[PDB]
Amino acid sequence: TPGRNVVVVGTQWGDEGKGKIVDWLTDHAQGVVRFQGGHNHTGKKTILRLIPSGIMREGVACYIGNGVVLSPEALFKEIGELEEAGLSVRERLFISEATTLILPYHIAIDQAREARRGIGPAYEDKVGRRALRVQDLFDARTFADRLRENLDFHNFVLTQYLGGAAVDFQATLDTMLGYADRLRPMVADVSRRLYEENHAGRNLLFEGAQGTLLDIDHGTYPFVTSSNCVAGAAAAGAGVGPQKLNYILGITKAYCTRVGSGPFPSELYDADNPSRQDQIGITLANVGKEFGSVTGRPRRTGWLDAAALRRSIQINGVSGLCMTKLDVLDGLDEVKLCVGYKIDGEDADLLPRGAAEVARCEPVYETFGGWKESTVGINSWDALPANARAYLTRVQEVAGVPIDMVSTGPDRDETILLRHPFKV
Amino acid sequence: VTPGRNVVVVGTQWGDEGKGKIVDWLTDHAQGVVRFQGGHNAGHTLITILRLIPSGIMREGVACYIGNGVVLSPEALFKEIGELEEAGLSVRERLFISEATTLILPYHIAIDQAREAGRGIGPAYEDKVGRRALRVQDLFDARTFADRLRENLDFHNFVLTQYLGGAAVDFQATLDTMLGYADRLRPMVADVSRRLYEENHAGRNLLFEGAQGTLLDIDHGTYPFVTSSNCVAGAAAAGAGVGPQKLNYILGITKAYCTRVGSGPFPSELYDADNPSRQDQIGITLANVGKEFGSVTGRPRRTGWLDAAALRRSIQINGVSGLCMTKLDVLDGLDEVKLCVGYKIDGEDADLLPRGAAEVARCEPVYETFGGWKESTVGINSWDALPANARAYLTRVQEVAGVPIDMVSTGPDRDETILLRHPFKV
Ligand SMILES: [Ca+2]
Numbered sequence: 001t002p003g004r005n006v007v008v009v010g011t012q013w014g015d016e017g018k019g020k021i022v023d024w025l026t027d028h029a030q031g032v033v034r035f036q037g038g039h040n041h042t043g044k045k046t047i048l049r050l051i052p053s054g055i056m057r058e059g060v061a062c063y064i065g066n067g068v069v070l071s072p073e074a075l076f077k078e079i080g081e082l083e084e085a086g087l088s089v090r091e092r093l094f095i096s097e098a099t100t101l102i103l104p105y106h107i108a109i110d111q112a113r114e115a116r117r118g119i120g121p122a123y124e125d126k127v128g129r130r131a132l133r134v135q136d137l138f139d140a141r142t143f144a145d146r147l148r149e150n151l152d153f154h155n156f157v158l159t160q161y162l163g164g165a166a167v168d169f170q171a172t173l174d175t176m177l178g179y180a181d182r183l184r185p186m187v188a189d190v191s192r193r194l195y196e197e198n199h200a201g202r203n204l205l206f207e208g209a210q211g212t213l214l215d216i217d218h219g220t221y222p223f224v225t226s227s228n229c230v231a232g233a234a235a236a237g238a239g240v241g242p243q244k245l246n247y248i249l250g251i252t253k254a255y256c257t258r259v260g261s262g263p264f265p266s267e268l269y270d271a272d273n274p275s276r277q278d279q280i281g282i283t284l285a286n287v288g289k290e291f292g293s294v295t296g297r298p299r300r301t302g303w304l305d306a307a308a309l310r311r312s313i314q315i316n317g318v319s320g321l322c323m324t325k326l327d328v329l330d331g332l333d334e335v336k337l338c339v340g341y342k343i344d345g346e347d348a349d350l351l352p353r354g355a356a357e358v359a360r361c362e363p364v365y366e367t368f369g370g371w372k373e374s375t376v377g378i379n380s381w382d383a384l385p386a387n388a389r390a391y392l393t394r395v396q397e398v399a400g401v402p403i404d405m406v407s408t409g410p411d412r413d414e415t416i417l418l419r420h421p422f423k424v
Numbered sequence: 425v426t427p428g429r430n431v432v433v434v435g436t437q438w439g440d441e442g443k444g445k446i447v448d449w450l451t452d453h454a455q456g457v458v459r460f461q462g463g464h465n466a467g468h469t470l471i472t473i474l475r476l477i478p479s480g481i482m483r484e485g486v487a488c489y490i491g492n493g494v495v496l497s498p499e500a501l502f503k504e505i506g507e508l509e510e511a512g513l514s515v516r517e518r519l520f521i522s523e524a525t526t527l528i529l530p531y532h533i534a535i536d537q538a539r540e541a542g543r544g545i546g547p548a549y550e551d552k553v554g555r556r557a558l559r560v561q562d563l564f565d566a567r568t569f570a571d572r573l574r575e576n577l578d579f580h581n582f583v584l585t586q587y588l589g590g591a592a593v594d595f596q597a598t599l600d601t602m603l604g605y606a607d608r609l610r611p612m613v614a615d616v617s618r619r620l621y622e623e624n625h626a627g628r629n630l631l632f633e634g635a636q637g638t639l640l641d642i643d644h645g646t647y648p649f650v651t652s653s654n655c656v657a658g659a660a661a662a663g664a665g666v667g668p669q670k671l672n673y674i675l676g677i678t679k680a681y682c683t684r685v686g687s688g689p690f691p692s693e694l695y696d697a698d699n700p701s702r703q704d705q706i707g708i709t710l711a712n713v714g715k716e717f718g719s720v721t722g723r724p725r726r727t728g729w730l731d732a733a734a735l736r737r738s739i740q741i742n743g744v745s746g747l748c749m750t751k752l753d754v755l756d757g758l759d760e761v762k763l764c765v766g767y768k769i770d771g772e773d774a775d776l777l778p779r780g781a782a783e784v785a786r787c788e789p790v791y792e793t794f795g796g797w798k799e800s801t802v803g804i805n806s807w808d809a810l811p812a813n814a815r816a817y818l819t820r821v822q823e824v825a826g827v828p829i830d831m832v833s834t835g836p837d838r839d840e841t842i843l844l845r846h847p848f849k850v
């Protein structure tokens with residue numbers, strides 16, 4: 001449909017498996033837009049954390065919105081790998097003049113806090129109204145002046161409060177200003193360009209980069225990220241109106257994971273928690289390959305939480321679901337769906353607000369007979385095993401929205417398509 | 425009125441666009457009114473200024489929501505509730521306050537005070553993004569509230585006493601002050617996100633009420649001369665816990681000339697009481713006739729000509745559906761009126777407000793001049809009854825803006841309105 005956009009978000013806490021799907025939708029988009037987060041997606045193997053995934057398709061414009069926090073070092077490392085693999089990138093990568101920078105002292109602030117990637121500290125400077133943004137790199141004198149003021153405060157905090165080491169002004173200034181000439185030709189008025197893209201009838205994909213249950217308002221605060229990342233964040237973070245956010249595709253894993261700390265009502269297994277060693281959870285982790293891309297650390301696993309999904313559907317305005325990793329359940333004798341909670345002896349049908357309440361939730365489960373067929377690669381709904389269809393039928397009911405897609409494998413045609421996100 | 429349709433009402437400029445009459449006008453068609461951003465720095469005048477409580481409260485029966493994106497001062501809240509109850513309204517039974525709303529505490533106020541040498545709003549949003557904020561729900565476990573307050577005070581007192589040259593804020597006094605609000609707040613605490621979902625599912629209509637001018641938006645405004653949060657129309661989604669699809673129609677409230685309060689570049693500026701180089705009698709007259717005096721300090725706002733290049737930017741970053749023009753009558757007396765339609769910057773043409781203080785500060789306005797009408801436009805309720813020269817001015821604003829003028833408010837009463845399209849009808 002001319003002028004129609006999709007937002008692709010993870011409905012859970014990340015690692016939902018957005019990659020195959022973003023690529024699948026990028027075939028119908030003329031622009032792909034990052035609107036939040038930092039550098040937090042895979043004939044040479046290349047891993048992208050910052051650059052929109054659309055860069056893999058020739059003639060697709062990639063936009064880093066104002067709402068991103070940008071490390072120039074990570075950026076140029078990715079560009080470099082891309083170019084080495086033969087891709088033409090810089091002429092079709094557009095970076096908001098108002099994108100917030102990650103500076104060396106943000107990384108040092110994270111390390112000093114930990115001792116007792118700089119994304120939180122960057123968003124902290126932003127809200128503090130002292131942040132240096134991309135455009136500021138192009139006036140050396142006033143960049144140095146703001147940097148100086150920022151380091152006076154942050155070095156006071158680092159040395160006097162966190163007991164750590166001061167960050168050098170001149171080294172920091174030299175490092176930052178050393179990116180200016182390379183960044184210049186990509187700096188752009190992304191907001192304006194996005195309005196023009198749609199006014200010309202072209203389609204945009206707004207690519208989410210963190211699980212929406214990590215949203216700073218709606219997640220299990222304080223175990224959340226340092227910004228909003230619900231699908232409505234794409235408006236402010238890209239410089240467009242909410243009416244451009246036409247269809248919201250909610251990527252949903254068939255079971256749940258978390259990384260790090262934060263409560264998790266349906267949790268089965270956490271390698272670091274002796275009281276959560278459920279073998280079904282260990283199975284989900286191994287069969288699902290739920291280990292960090294970089295660190296190799298296992299993720300926490302649990303059953304799908306439809307009460308959490310229902311909250312997610314409401315806060316994101318999810319239009320339809322795309323289910324992933326169904327196959328990880330193939331050959332379980334039974335599968336459970338968390339459909340609500342008991343909390344302080346009361347029934348609750350939506351994930352509560354804040355860590356304290358969500359840690360008090362005992363999951364209420366419905367039980368389903370498993371199927372044994374492999375479901376790998378199936379591309380029609382009717383060909384799914386009855387017991388898989390019954391589980392997913394129940395997920396739709398509790399969630400309150402349709403499953404529009406089921407991704408059954410890494411290839412484009414390993415996909416059950418019930419409704420096309422880019423067709424009105 | 426289309427069932428389940430909502431309107432988001434925002435100022436298109438840097439605030440004080442004169443939203444009051446229109447928010448009252450829209451509230452006649454809405455069963456709930458929602459604040460989604462900001463703090464006790466809205467301003468809705470009554471004959472008394474409401475700054476926190478949503479403006480729906482003036483209409484009996486209408487549900488009023490304080491969304492999660494708000495920063496809430498209990499003392500400010502209970503002051504407004506008391507003024508409203510003394511005037512004989514029933515407030516508390518239909519005021520719903522998000523469990524996740526961020527609290528403003530005394531140390532936030534002390535941090536602002538030390539910095540000066542507003543009202544704790546910025547420091548509250550700083551604790552939020554720092555992932556250490558106390559939120560409304562936190563008042564109802566007194567033990568863990570004290571634990572987190574202790575931690576916050578360790579750090580904020582270090583900053584206050586050793587960096588900003590201010591006095592420490594005492595733990596126990598702060599603990600007592602905040603817990604003293606719990607019993608009164610309790611009945612009003614809610615799952616606003618869920619309730620809004622349910623309201624729309626029942627086919628009721630909601631009005632999402634903007635607090636600050638959208639050009640103060642932290643990403644899109646003249647950074648750092650911006651507010652400490654996002655306030656573009658889109659922010660109603662995160663801020664109230666609803667998806668962007670519920671934000672059906674965005675009404676852009678737009679004053680017929682421009683104002684700013686406090687520092688920041690202002691390309692079409694005519695008058696700034698503190699700037700000797702900006703003392704144009706026209707802008708002085710805009711401030712007097714327009715009554716542009718701060719509600720607290722009483723000091724004149726900065727005034728200038730309508731900036732349509734700024735409006736064009738605001739249309740885009742908000743997804744403004746249609747404009748509501750306000751305070752046209754402030755121009756009734758003028759021989760001629762000027763419209764900023766773009767800029768010269770570094771010798772080259774710009775058609776949109778640039779990003780950030782530096783580039784906006786280098787913009788010289790490009791004006792089109794319009795013959796004044798020298799005739800009252802107070803109370804006119806049809807486009808065709810506007811003077812030829814007022815219609816010409818507004819037609820050009822509409823053209824440069826790129827969206828329609830759907831309403832002109834010509835007066836403080838409901839029927840002093842030109843209605844071209846109804847916001848609540850698909
Ligand atoms: Ca109540």
Ligand code: NA
Pocket residue numbers: 090091092185186187
């Ligand atoms: Na370029």
